[PDB]
Design a protein around this ligand. Structure first.
Ligand SMILES: *[C@@H]1O[C@H](CO)[C@@H](O[C@@H]2O[C@H](CO)[C@@H](O)[C@H](O)[C@H]2NC(C)=O)[C@H](O)[C@H]1NC(C)=O
Ligand SMILES: CC(C)CCC[C@@H](C)[C@H]1CC[C@H]2[C@@H]3CC=C4C[C@@H](O)CC[C@]4(C)[C@H]3CC[C@]12C
Ligand SMILES: CC(=O)N[C@@H]1[C@@H](O)[C@H](O)[C@@H](CO)O[C@H]1O
Ligand SMILES: CC(=O)N[C@@H]1[C@@H](O)[C@H](O)[C@@H](CO)O[C@H]1O
Ligand SMILES: CC(=O)N[C@@H]1[C@@H](O)[C@H](O)[C@@H](CO)O[C@H]1O
Ligand SMILES: CC(=O)N[C@@H]1[C@@H](O)[C@H](O)[C@@H](CO)O[C@H]1O
Ligand SMILES: CC(=O)N[C@@H]1[C@@H](O)[C@H](O)[C@@H](CO)O[C@H]1O
Ligand SMILES: CC(=O)N[C@@H]1[C@@H](O)[C@H](O)[C@@H](CO)O[C@H]1O
Ligand SMILES: CC(=O)N[C@@H]1[C@@H](O)[C@H](O)[C@@H](CO)O[C@H]1O
Ligand SMILES: CC(=O)N[C@@H]1[C@@H](O)[C@H](O)[C@@H](CO)O[C@H]1O
Ligand SMILES: *[C@@H]1O[C@H](CO)[C@@H](O)[C@H](O)[C@H]1NC(C)=O
Ligand SMILES: *[C@@H]1O[C@H](CO)[C@@H](O)[C@H](O)[C@H]1NC(C)=O
Length: 1133
């Protein structure tokens, strides 16, 4: 083994040295060079480390690595072979085999005058295969942020002219101003005149350099690339449903035809109860006090229980508690509580054009969208600074953004967190205004930094001539997707919108601090609303917009329903007693039910919004049945009055009917104890139902009687009219309603198929105020970013190997997410992840850093490591040490010094084994619809299952958690399918069982009433999934009420028809329905007559425009079916 040089001699040019000629054997490297050799040329680091280089040469090699690193650092395999080319030249103990000195000159030591010899030039015999592999591993590497190949910057020519041998030739030519002296390469896989070319093994860009150094990426490599995604599923059925409906229709038609052809070819208990009731009445018919006294008692119980009208309604608790939805939210809290909320603005520049700007030294045309005009950025910065300076007052105190913001690096840094493109310029007008240029070029400006910072937002030093940091003033990177909108692919320069985001404390556990934050928010909303700049359109996130709009909009419409309620109760008042006899009752009846309900609920605590539309419209049941019992008696007139004339007309039609009506109602509201977020309003009303029932018992009858004994004339006429109507109805049924009845069946059939073959969750569409609209419009337009978090809490974490396995799970999750997409982009996640396992690794790779104590004090630097061999081991496993260091950070360590810390961990003392709870979050955009977010949530749950299902263990111990400002809120829209089927199902049983608690005709009554259950439902669904309909936490309650009123109708028509004393074919039926038809047109008609004022009327928002919309449609359909349904059933019988 022999050298050609050893050590450094004279200056060549600049700061550059020739090496000293030396032709002896290699020399063991001093221990003081072991770090350098381990770092640069670890292949030589064994035995006596006998090399043809000294420590000075290795230091010089390290110092010269800056420019290759500048362009190749991202692809370690590419850089590795290059380093080996230089290591072999500099240090190989067999230099003489592949190097031949070709020029020299004297070196004279200035002090001793001893002569040595500069190696001025030499020839280097490089393997052909080595050179080609070195080029091959680097040829796809892309410059840090640039569609140009890194080799175009290291080859003295463009990448399309760069080849393996001319690249090496260029690097080795002193003319390049970097190489200290020229090395002339000769490329051969064969010996050349006894020289044995350097042909060291090489690594491709698809290979790992070592155990702690991964292969190169796709973006910077070719070998390790592909394949894209191919898991797209395409479903689409439905026609089947249509065919079935059609088939059914055909069958029906056939049946009808057949029928036509044929015609051409040819109880005790109940009674007893009634009797008892009558007896009671007769007794009661001997005193008014008792009754009223009872009403008075109810006046108290109702009002009494209403003590402390604390009937809350806020804030966002309707998904109900318990289960996973709530339990999951609570869990994430104990670990961190409320991650926090964001006030967010989207900003566009409608009066500004795009523009071009060549960035040195490429000079390629890069277009920049309207909002990235330099002047609009200055204007957006002024907006931003003004927002930071907003103050609100609460009590006598002042509230700033600095009091409520996420300031991640407090106290050492109170700097608030503002996600904005202006934070790439540290929110500084001057810094952004800067621009290093001369008479010839602009070398660096607000463009270069931008194009660099979108690729390296954590950088504390632009690689351009500006040398400005990218890191935001809050101490963390601002990711480009989260601050720009309306750009294509990752061409952030083409953005048509800026997004500005301020995280502020939600203060879920602190009431006094939350109120202060909400005071600030109100000022923020005001500031934005009144901000004047023709150059910018600014639009909303906040908090009140969604909470203030609902409480600010939902009011005017009140006057609508209110009015309608009055005009309706007026008619129902005129109807029967007309005068001041019936009015009193009702007013008391409606009050009793409403008052009683509030009292029944006060004994358990509860409250709600829709709980009002139900309470009011629900009261109808009490009025309807109550409005027909009195009317029927009015139509009475025999040998008796008051005495038996009241018990024979009351305990005869009111006993059974009412008795059955009250039950069918209590069964729908009573059994409302189910599982969901509506049982409260439900039960409360159902309870108010028996109450309202027992009320109108002796109260209405007695009162109506006690007092019942121009106005008279009017009553008679109405009665007469009713009678006439009944007669007409009878006549109609007499003819033949078989054809139309079949047609009706068709309508129901078509409805079931059209209603069962549509569906939907529920979106958010509030009135057109302003704020809310802005946020809704901005969201629709924007895209790519704006977020929620998927999040896991994990336990244990102590077995180096289980951490490696958990990291593989984590990396795999990042992949699927960055893949799963839809239409023209991903849907699932976003997405990507920054747990921490990578931070530790980074630390291991590198080194220390300075911490500067606040306000003053000497600098503190402290740390260490642990390479080379150990380095790989340390990073591989163990974790207490790393963990306790990694949690305490706030100043990088290398070429700069910034902040790169976080949170989520919280062990005790130095028990690193007890660490919790690491949390990884990938924010994904959506804002599509109630069904869109629900679909994404559905995917995330399966993602959580897949990760937890992959590698589990013992029983239970934490799992996946998808907490996104949309869950708990949409969590309900999840089990909506089971709810509807379960909710209605529970009523179908309570109704079929109740209607039998005083009958049990097997198929007679059972089917009669049972048919009404599916009869009306198909209508409600049709209108909902058919025309102007909807569905949600309310619609579900809507369907419930529908089945309720429906039961009411049927109940009366049927309890008196089924029996039928003097029985017949279809004659007795027409007789019963007659006395029941008059009431069907009274309450029903009126009720509709009221909705119209509510439905046919107007409003200032679609909100109720639907709620009270279907009501009238669904309520109307049910009423119509009442008469038809009964008639059809009778005929069938
Ligand atoms: C160039 O290749 C040679 C031959 O593989 C490397 O020398 C070997 O290095 C390993 C790793 O330390 C030792 O185990 C062998 O004993 C060495 N063999 C010989 C013949 O010396 C050398 O490390 C490579 N050069 C560089 C810079 O990595
Ligand atoms: C202009 C760009 C492409 C140059 C990129 C390659 C540079 C970094 C290369 C070209 C020639 C190389 C030098 C070749 C010879 C020596 C002598 C050695 O005893 C110390 C290292 C040193 C000084 C090398 C450092 C790296 C070097 C300067
Ligand atoms: C000069 C000198 O020390 N040479 C030794 C050599 O004898 C030995 O074989 C080798 C083993 O690694 O270590 C070196
Ligand atoms: C051997 C020789 O050339 N002599 C020189 C001498 O003239 C000079 O004064 C000295 C400076 O230190 O360097 C030596
Ligand atoms: C482009 C790439 O992946 N690497 C190339 C390879 O395709 C080619 O076969 C080889 C031949 O020299 O050069 C290298
Ligand atoms: C476009 C380009 O750079 N072509 C050069 C070619 O002129 C040169 O002869 C060859 C030497 O290997 O390298 C390549
Ligand atoms: C989940 C959570 O952290 N809850 C906290 C509780 O620990 C603390 O005692 C209380 C003090 O006001 O505020 C709340
Ligand atoms: C408008 C603005 O950005 N700057 C104001 C400044 O003029 C004022 O003095 C300060 C109150 O001290 O509030 C801030
Ligand atoms: C305008 C006003 O209310 N000023 C009062 C001040 O007089 C009082 O001393 C202080 C006590 O904290 O609260 C504030
Ligand atoms: C059947 C089975 O898998 N049992 C294992 C048990 O051997 C192990 O000690 C434990 C550690 O938590 O996990 C479980
Ligand atoms: C080195 O190669 C050159 C030709 O390039 C030759 O003239 C010289 O004699 C050789 N010296 C040695 C030691 O091989
Ligand atoms: C879940 O992972 C399993 C393998 O464990 C895989 O077969 C399936 O395609 C994955 N599904 C989703 C939705 O990620």
């Amino acid at each position: 083994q022999s050298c050609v040089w050893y050590g450094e001699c004279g200056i060549a040019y600049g700061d550059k040295r020739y090496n000293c000629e030396y032709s002896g054997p290699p020399k063991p490297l001093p221990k003081d060079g072991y770090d350098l050799v381990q770092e640069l040329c670890p292949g030589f680091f064994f035995g006596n480390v006998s090399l043809c280089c000294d420590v000075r040469q290795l230091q010089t090699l390290k110092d010269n690595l800056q420019l290759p690193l500048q362009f190749l650092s991202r692809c370690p395999s590419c850089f590795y072979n290059l380093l080996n080319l230089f290591c072999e030249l500099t240090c190989s103990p067999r230099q003489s085999q592949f190097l031949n000195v070709t020029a020299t000159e004297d070196y004279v030591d200035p002090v001793t005058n001893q002569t040595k010899t500069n190696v001025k030039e030499l020839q280097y015999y490089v393997g052909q295969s080595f050179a080609n592999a070195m080029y091959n591993a680097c040829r796809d590497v892309e410059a840090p942020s640039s569609n140009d190949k890194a080799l175009g910057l290291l080859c003295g020519k463009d990448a399309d002219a760069c080849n393996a041998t001319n690249w090496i030739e260029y690097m080795f030519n002193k003319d390049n101003g970097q190489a200290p002296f020229t090395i002339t390469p000769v490329f051969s896989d064969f010996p050349v005149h006894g020289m044995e070319p350097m042909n060291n093994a090489t690594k491709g860009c698809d290979e790992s350099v070592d155990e702690v150094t991964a292969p190169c990426s796709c973006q910077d490599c070719s070998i390790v690339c592909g394949p894209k995604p191919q898991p797209p599923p395409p479903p689409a059925p439905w026609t089947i449903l249509g065919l079935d409906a059609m088939y059914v229709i055909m069958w029906i038609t056939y049946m009808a035809f057949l029928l036509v052809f044929f015609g051409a070819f040819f109880a005790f208990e109940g009674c007893l109860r009634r009797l008892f009731t009558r007896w009671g009445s007769f007794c009661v018919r001997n005193p008014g006090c008792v009754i009223f006294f009872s009403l008075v008692f109810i006046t108290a119980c109702s009002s009494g229980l209403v003590f402390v009208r604390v009937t809350t309604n806020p804030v966002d608790l309707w998904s109900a508690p318990s289960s996973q939805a709530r339990l999951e939210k609570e869990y994430f809290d104990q670990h961190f509580g409320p991650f926090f909320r964001t006030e967010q603005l989207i900003i566009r520049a409608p009066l500004t054009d795009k523009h071009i700007y060549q960035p040195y030294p490429s000079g390629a045309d890069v277009p920049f969208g309207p909002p990235l005009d330099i002047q609009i950025l200055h204007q957006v910065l002024d907006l931003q600074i003004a927002i930071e300076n907003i103050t609100a007052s609460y009590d006598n105190e002042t509230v700033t953004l600095q009091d409520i913001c996420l300031a991640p690096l407090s106290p050492y840094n109170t700097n608030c967190t503002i996600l904005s493109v202006l934070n790439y310029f540290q929110n500084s007008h001057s810094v952004l205004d800067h621009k290093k240029g001369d008479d010839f070029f602009v070398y660096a400006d607000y463009h270069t930094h931008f194009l660099y910072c979108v690729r390296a937002p954590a950088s504390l030093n632009d690689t351009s001539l500006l040398h400005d940091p990218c890191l935001g003033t809050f101490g963390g990177p601002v990711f480009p997707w989260l601050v720009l909108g309306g750009y294509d692919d990752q061409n952030y320069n083409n953005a048509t919108a800026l997004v500005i985001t301020f995280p502020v404390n939600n203060y879920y556990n602190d009431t006094e601090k939350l109120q202060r934050a909400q005071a600030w928010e109100k000022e923020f909303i005001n500031f934005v609303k009144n901000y004047k700049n023709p150059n910018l359109t600014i639009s909303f996130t906040a908090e009140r917009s969604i909470e203030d709009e609902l409480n600010r909009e939902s009011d005017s419409d009140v006057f609508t329903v209110v009015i309608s309620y009055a005009i309706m109760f007026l008619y129902i008042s005129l109807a029967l007693g007309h005068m001041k006899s019936c009015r009193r009752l009702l007013v008391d009846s409606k009050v009793s039910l409403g008052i009683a309900g509030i009292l029944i609920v006060l004994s358990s605590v509860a409250c709600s919004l829709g709980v009002f539309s139900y309470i009011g419209l629900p009261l109808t049941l009490i009025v309807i049945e109550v409005i027909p019992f009195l009317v029927l008696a009015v139509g009475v007139d025999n040998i008796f009055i008051l005495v038996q004339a009241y018990q024979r007309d009351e305990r005869l039609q009111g006993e059974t009917l009412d008795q059955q009506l009250g039950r069918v109602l209590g069964e729908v509201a009573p059994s409302m104890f189910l599982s969901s977020f509506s049982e409260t309003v439900a039960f409360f009303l159902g309870a108010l139902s028996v109450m309202p029932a027992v009320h109108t018992f002796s109260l209405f009858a007695g009162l109506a009687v006690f007092i019942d004994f121009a106005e008279d004339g009017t009553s008679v006429q109405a009665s007469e009219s009713c009678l006439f109507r009944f007669f007409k109805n009878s006549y109609s049924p007499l003819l033949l309603k078989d054809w139309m009845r079949p047609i009706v069946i068709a309508i129901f059939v078509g409805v079931l198929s059209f209603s069962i073959a549509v569906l939907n969750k529920v979106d958010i569409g509030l009135d057109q105020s302003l704020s809310m609209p802005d946020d809704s419009y901005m969201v629709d337009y924007f895209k790519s970013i704006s977020q929620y978090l998927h999040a896991g809490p994990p336990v244990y974490f102590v077995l180096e190997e289980g951490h490696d396995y958990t990291s593989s799970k984590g990396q795999n999750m990042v992949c699927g997410g960055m893949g799963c997409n839809n239409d023209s982009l991903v849907q699932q996640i976003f997405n990507a992840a920054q747990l921490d396992n990578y931070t530790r690794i980074g630390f291991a790779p590198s080194s220390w850093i300075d911490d500067y104590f606040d306000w003053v004090k000497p600098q503190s630097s402290c740390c260490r490591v642990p390479e080379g061999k150990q380095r790989p081991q340390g990073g591989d496993f163990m974790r207490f040490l790393p963990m306790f260091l990694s949690d305490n950070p706030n100043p990088k360590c290398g070429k700069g010094g910034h902040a790169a810390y976080s949170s989520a961990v919280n062990i005790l003392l130095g028990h690193g084994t007890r660490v919790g709870a690491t949390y990884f979050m990938t924010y994904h955009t959506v804002l599509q619809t109630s069904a869109d977010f629900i679909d994404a949530l559905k995917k995330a749950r399966l993602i959580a299952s897949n990760v937890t299902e992959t590698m589990g263990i013992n029983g239970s111990a934490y799992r996946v958690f998808p907490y996104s400002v949309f869950y708990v809120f949409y969590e309900q829209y999840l089990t909506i399918i089971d709810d509807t089927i379960f909710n209605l199902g529970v009523s179908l049983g309570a109704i079929f069982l109740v209607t039998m608690v005083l009958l049990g005709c097997e198929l007679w009554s059972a089917v009669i009433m049972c048919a009404t259950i599916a009869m009306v439902l198909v209508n409600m669904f049709g209108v909902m999934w058919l025309w102007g309909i909807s569905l949600n936490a309310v619609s579900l309650v809507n369907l419930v009420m529908s089945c309720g009123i429906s039961v009411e109708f049927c109940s009366h028509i049927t309890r008196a028809f089924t029996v039928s004393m003097k029985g017949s074919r279809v004659e007795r039926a027409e007789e019963a329905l007659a006395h029941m038809g008059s009431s069907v047109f009274s309450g029903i008609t009126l009720t509709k007559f009221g909705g119209i004022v509510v439905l046919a009327f107007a409003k200032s928002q679609i909100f109720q425009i639907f709620y009270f919309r279907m009501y009238l449609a669904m309520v109307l359909l049910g009423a119509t079916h009442g008469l038809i349904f009964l008639p059809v059933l009778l005929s069938y019988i």
